[PDB]
Amino acid sequence: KVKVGVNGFGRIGRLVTRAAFNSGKVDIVAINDPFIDLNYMVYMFQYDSTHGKFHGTVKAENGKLVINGNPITIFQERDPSKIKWGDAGAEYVVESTGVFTTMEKAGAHLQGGAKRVIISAPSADAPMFVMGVNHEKYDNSLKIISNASCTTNCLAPLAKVIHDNFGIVEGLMTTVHAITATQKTVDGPSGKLWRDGRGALQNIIPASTGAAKAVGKVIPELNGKLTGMAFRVPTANVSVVDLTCRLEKPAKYDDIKKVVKQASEGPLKGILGYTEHQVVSSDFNSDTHSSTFDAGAGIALNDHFVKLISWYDNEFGYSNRVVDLMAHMASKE
Amino acid sequence: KVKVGVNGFGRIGRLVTRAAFNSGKVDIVAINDPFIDLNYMVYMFQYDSTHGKFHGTVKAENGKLVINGNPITIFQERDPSKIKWGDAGAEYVVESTGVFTTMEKAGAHLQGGAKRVIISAPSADAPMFVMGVNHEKYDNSLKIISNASCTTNCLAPLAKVIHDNFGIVEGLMTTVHAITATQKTVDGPSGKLWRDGRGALQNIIPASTGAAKAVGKVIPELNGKLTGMAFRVPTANVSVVDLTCRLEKPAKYDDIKKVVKQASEGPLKGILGYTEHQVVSSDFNSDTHSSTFDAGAGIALNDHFVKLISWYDNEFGYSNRVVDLMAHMASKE
Amino acid sequence: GKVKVGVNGFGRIGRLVTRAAFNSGKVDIVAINDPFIDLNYMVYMFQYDSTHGKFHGTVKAENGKLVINGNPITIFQERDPSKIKWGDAGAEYVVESTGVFTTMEKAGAHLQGGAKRVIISAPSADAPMFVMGVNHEKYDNSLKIISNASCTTNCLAPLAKVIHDNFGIVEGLMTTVHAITATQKTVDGPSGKLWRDGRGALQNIIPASTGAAKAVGKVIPELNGKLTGMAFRVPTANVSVVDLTCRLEKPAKYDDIKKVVKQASEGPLKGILGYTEHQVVSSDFNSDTHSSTFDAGAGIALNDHFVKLISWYDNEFGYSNRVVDLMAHMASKE
Amino acid sequence: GKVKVGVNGFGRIGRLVTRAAFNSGKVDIVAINDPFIDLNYMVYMFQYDSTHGKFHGTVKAENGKLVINGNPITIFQERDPSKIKWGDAGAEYVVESTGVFTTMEKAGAHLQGGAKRVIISAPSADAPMFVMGVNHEKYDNSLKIISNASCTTNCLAPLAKVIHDNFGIVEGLMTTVHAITATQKTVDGPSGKLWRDGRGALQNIIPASTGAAKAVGKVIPELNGKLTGMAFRVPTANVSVVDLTCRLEKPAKYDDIKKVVKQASEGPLKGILGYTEHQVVSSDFNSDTHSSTFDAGAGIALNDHFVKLISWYDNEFGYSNRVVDLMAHMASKE
């Protein structure tokens, strides 16, 4: 099992750490957060308002964060080039702070001793991957890669199935997204994105998302054929993608249900899900799928113009894919 | 000023009454609700969690509901044919209970003495109207009409402008809607629509809506060219329409903005609004427009496939249109 | 052997009692009656839960029965409780969860169908009330119709018992900051009897009257007339908190209050009364089966005789598990 | 003769004090200092408000100034308060609303720029604290730096004053069910000092410590050491409620408590202390400029000496209007 280091014990960093222990696919050996001390890290990992108390043991012992008897080395560095990743035995580093997404900034970890870096966010220049869509294009020469956004990971598996079977001429997407840590409880300041500063509890907030554009950077045939926007709404977790698209070949709705059902049962098992149940957002809380096609929620205007709905736990689905990507990277070593 | 009777003092009935006094276009002279007594009606009209305390005076006096010194006759009938609408001087009756939407059911009010009935909801058989779109097709022979739904009243004015200028080849709509009185606080029973029974506070609930299909009945050229679905989200009021459509003529996004701005300043003034501000849902609370085009929120894939965003106060916007429709009917009398 | 139980009403309490029965395995649900929810809808409502998640097990409709974990349950669709053939389905006890038959005369209708005992999963004006860990030992086989009090009394009474037994409660006033309930409205709607309860649940803090503190007196007779309170309904889907401000007879340092509560949670009230010193919030008690959990860090003392004691409760799980525990206790006395 | 005021910080308090100044017209805002919010963003933040709606007038950027209702306001972008040219803009008083300069030494920096008096819109460790209607008459012209206490202190103190003056408060314990604040997090985030305050604001009832009941003893010296309490943050955007459980020296029937509160709201505490017998909920006090409104129907008495008194407050508009009223009072004493 590959030994992993996690930079940042924020919402992504903690959920990637929890996915690592829950799945057991990788071994967390080090965590770096210059602001959260060891005692606070135990509290933040143990208790979760959204996903509940950690099913396992969490304790501070000899200056280390012990999760299920596994001692994890804690670092408090502000500069990523100063983290002694190699000393703690961290082969891979999950860059989850969101402030080092370019290969230049993400490359500071390689100076500490890390061999590979996985950016748990979209990157402007690093190669992007989505498990089940283009992870086979990963090779050992790639020292710094990105796992795209949770929305890019929800849309791309559905886009792959729909394009492979009927061909997406063009598509426009909307994601009705749950509130995130970047939003404000009451009307506050967000100098760059004014709407994002408005009260998260009281508002439907339109937001810009490069996730539908990013899908074309992972399914190169769809490059320039997809774009979209988001609406942040007052729910703590679980989001939904709404893809309105035009198809090349005609597609009856029940043929597109059969097509997604096959992919969910075969190659995209655990990545792409399929349901015909009368589901609502809370039904996908702690669901580890990247995306789950909602058959009953979608609607077709004609054989070439459809609206396809797909749910995703923006927190769990994505953190599990970061772990799956590293497990795949380790197998190619 | 025409004298109006309101059947049902529910959320629509109270807000239509409020719009009548706020705008002064109509005179409410009678209200019928077999369940809410006069004292409770004073409380429900005066205090509103969403729109605040009524700006004016409300009292119970001599068995009459007195709003701004205007005495309103109160009836407690379960059978709509037994309401003495004519005795109270009610020329038009707003049928807001939602349980008498067919012309046969809504026609019962004419037995009590009413001359015309306006169903404040979609009807299976009554002629439908949307102010600013097809209200000129109303004529004095029509004794029972429908004002369509609040979502139709938001989509149809935008669809009218977009189709008149560029031609809508086909369109698919999503409405991210605020919670309604038909939803449940916690997981409860809704035998017909299972998803609508699930906890309103905790969930994004997909729902079916014939509002996009209904635009084809007020704009006969778009018949069969539009359909959609809804997502109910945890906000008390203000909803948004997201129209993804293909245009016949090419349309740069600034040309779409230009023609919408012109319609909002000219013929659809007060019905269709236009904004370039960094708005969120709460900015449209108590906004009486039927729909307000959000220029900054929309996105174009090319010059033939666009996503157009438009806000609507699902409560005040529609209620004011019920009053405007009656103010129109009176002018044709 | 395990008591066979019938559940009247498949509403929020009825489903969670049925859930607690299978999760704990203390009793066997053999029949359910709801005249409005059909068998197919019952499968959906039991399987999926927004608050507590999908049911850990299997649930399916098969041959007109609701099979949960391979156990077939007989479904009835009766509006009149006297017309339910409880005895035919083998139901020895009936949980009256509809909330509309809380008097002994109304709840007694279930005995006409063949039931032997009726447990009202709500407060009753006349039936004997019980709170597990406080006065369940006063239950005897002569009692054919009993009440399990409310969720709020089942939270307050175990804390009141410990505090009164050790220091004596001279007088107390409590406030419960409660989660939204099925009786509330999504937007400003009509609630003819309780006008405030009709106002939008999402937008408001709604003051409400509750006889739960008064009901503690009917379970700890020494505190009769010594306790009263009110509630504030707030916009959270589940988990509530009790705030008891009281005057004590004997002096009590806050660490002595903590010490005696910790002892009771580890000994006789294990699983009923909990104790924590952690930096907890409401979501930390979601699906917690305790009747009440004393929050040591949240409470505050003015002086040795005047304190504010905070205690959390999953108003949904804590209570339904106590309905199951009460019937398991009744079965042991048979 | 409107006193010309400067506002340091265009955060929620700063904007709401500016809004109260124009809505009430009691003082003239002439300058605003915020080193992070530029003029164009200030127009947006003042014009649109999720809680209180769009401003009742006009807001625009013109010639590098913020013009509200035709009144041009000078904008400063200084990080050091001592470097703000308050005197050049004509600002006689400065409202210190950033929350980071609450000591008299820190708040005194504004006097170096040319200000004559500084009003801290928050509690201060050392500055004299005032609550309008309870101790504002103790303000005198020697006081160049004062504090307006907190929003909860301004709610509790006027009710405590009436109750103590008529019946005498032997001892009291207060709980405030408070709306969410800017210091909370949307989802589980870090708050190193107060761990519970970092947990998701939308999902939780969060117990919190508050020195607001203790602080009432400063403005009402007769209640020093006689009051303490805690808070519960709940998922509502605005409007909070105080719950005072207290023991009275003199017996008081609940109708006598109502009678004396109604008299104070109609007489000396008109506009500060309100009184209602209506079936009110929190949203009914949104944009209500009262410091506290006694809810007659929500409170409950156990006996003539032990009561729970409920009082609502718009934690935003109540307090902001008191900052403006306090400065209008200071100007009258000049």
Residue numbers in the entry:
A (entry chain H), B (entry chain E): 3 to 335
C (entry chain A), D (entry chain C): 2 to 335
The authors write:
HsGAPDH crystal structures carrying a Cysteine-S-sulfonic acid modification of the catalytic cysteine Cys152. The protein sample from which crystal forms C and D were grown was analysed by mass spectrometry. HsGAPDH in crystal form C. The GAPDH monomer is in surface representation and coloured blue to red from N- to C-terminus. The inset shows the Cys152 S-sulfonic acid chains adopting slightly different conformations in different molecules in the asymmetric unit. The crystallisation conditions do not nominally contain redox active ingredients but crystal forms A,B grow at pH 8.5, while forms C,D grow at pH 6.5.
